[PDB]
């Protein structure tokens, strides 16, 4: 089924013609648009008082990356390299070797945050929930170099944001 948007026929009786002429001469639709804008002036603005007020977010929000660790205090990452295999932008570089106790742990874990596209594929490929994409979005930088994260930076990010990262994972993990 279809509709006509512009298939109207103006009436040609004297009253309609006079209405059209009065609209042309007295600018009725122009005044009506003025009235619309005037009415819109007298209603509350939608502006929020940043940085004292924040825009709403979700537990599913993707932000600055982090490397998590188990409650015992040991890091979750086991160098399976699935996050590096799935990364659409090839932003992750990983190097691993057996630790001093035979544990399978990384020695290099770099994310180029200028290559990242913040798709979250890395956190949904990880089987141990090690790499997450946390809630932080205010991490703008004055140099290009500070956006090339290494393992220490990501581990510090995890230890910094662990409380809210774990709370968000608790809120959202049943949807995965």
């Amino acid at each position: 089924t279809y509709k006509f948007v512009n298939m109207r026929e103006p009436s040609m009786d004297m009253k309609s013609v006079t209405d059209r002429a009065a609209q042309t001469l007295l600018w009725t639709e122009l005044v009506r648009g003025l009235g619309m804008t005037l009415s819109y002036l007298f209603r509350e603005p939608a502006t929020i008082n940043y940085p004292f007020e924040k825009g709403p977010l979700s537990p599913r929000f993707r932000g600055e990356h982090a490397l998590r660790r188990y409650p015992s205090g040991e890091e979750r990452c086991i160098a399976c390299k699935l996050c590096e295999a799935v990364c659409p932008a090839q932003a992750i570089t990983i190097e691993a070797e057996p630790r001093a106790d035979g544990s399978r742990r990384t020695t290099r874990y770099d994310i180029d945050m200028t290559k990242c596209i913040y798709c979250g594929f890395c956190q949904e490929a990880c089987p141990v929930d090690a790499i997450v994409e946390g809630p932080n979005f205010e991490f703008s930088t004055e140099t290009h170099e500070e956006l090339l994260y290494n393992k220490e930076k990501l581990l510090n990010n995890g230890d910094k944001w662990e409380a809210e990262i774990a709370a968000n994972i608790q809120a959202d993990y049943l949807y995965r």
């Binding site: 002036l41 007298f42 509350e44 603005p45």
Partner: protein, 70 residues
């Protein structure tokens, strides 16, 4: 809300207040406390000049009333 526009407008208003009133006050100060005499048409200019000559102080606004008729 919209009334936060009112402060700035007020300042604008205050500025537009200053010229007009100022002129009026100056016209009162330089014409002996009365309206500045406007002189088109050159007849009332003649009246102003006659007043200036009559006053004796070379000021047209110094009026000489009936007490000067003796």
């Amino acid at each position: 809300m919209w009334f936060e526009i009112l402060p700035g407008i007020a300042v604008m208003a205050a500025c537009l207040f200053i010229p007009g009133m100022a002129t009026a006050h100056i016209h009162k100060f330089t014409n002996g406390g009365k309206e500045k005499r406007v002189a088109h048409f050159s007849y009332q200019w003649n009246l102003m000049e006659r007043d200036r000559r009559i006053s004796g102080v070379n000021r047209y606004h110094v009026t000489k009333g009936l007490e000067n008729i003796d």
